[PDB]
Assembly symmetry: C3
Homo-oligomer: 95 residues x 3
């Protein structure tokens, strides 16, 4: 049914991040960074391999269905519905 | 070919919506609602399972290729081109 | 591996475009046109069949993984990172 395809892109993480972390683009450099949890519609992917500020390239999921309880959401994303639709319009969804 | 993958998310419809209805996010709650046909780029999916105002979860297509004539476009979407590219950037397209 | 799915949409090119040309929506007509290389986040597809200003329909990739070296980026897209994440959030990625 729904394949979880991976992808790679330049990383600009501020700190170490585990797999299952939502990612967004930095608006200035357009590197992948952790989603802030507060910018609506900014999530673009889910980190697939743990990484940090030294990681030049990140490996991330660009498709699939992920359980709500399995994604390591940022604490600032305090609303369950906005998390559940954080990937709407991408090939990623939340169950 | 181009399988049509489904997804689920919280719903906030105000009226009955048959399958094949384009959906957008509500800008306040970020629940899935009917695409208004007037906010450019806001369509995120196509309802897969008929639903209504009591539906708490909507089941929607997040990929696939759909015939222009089969999608139940909102009437306020009066321009054919803008309908045909309403899903550009998503995994959905119109033929 | 990650299938590259095609799509069709109304085209609005003003010049010849070979296959592998990044595409964006025209913000007035919402026809598919060449990505300018400067509007951040506007790339929505990669042309799959060469086209020109006479083409009424463009045939494009809406998913897949493409090599950075194979995509025919516009000259104005001068920053490698911004090209590499030009499709983030779509079903397309760059390797």
């Amino acid at each position: 049914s729904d394949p979880a395809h991976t992808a790679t892109a330049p990383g600009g993480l501020s700190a170490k991040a585990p797999a299952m972390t939502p990612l967004m683009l930095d608006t200035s450099s357009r590197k992948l960074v952790a989603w802030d949890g507060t910018t609506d519609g900014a999530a673009v992917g889910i980190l697939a391999v743990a990484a940090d500020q030294t990681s030049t390239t990140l490996t991330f999921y660009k498709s699939g269905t992920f359980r709500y309880e399995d994604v390591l959401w940022p604490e600032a994303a305090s609303d369950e519905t906005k998390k559940r639709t954080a990937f709407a319009g991408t090939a990623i969804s939340i169950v």
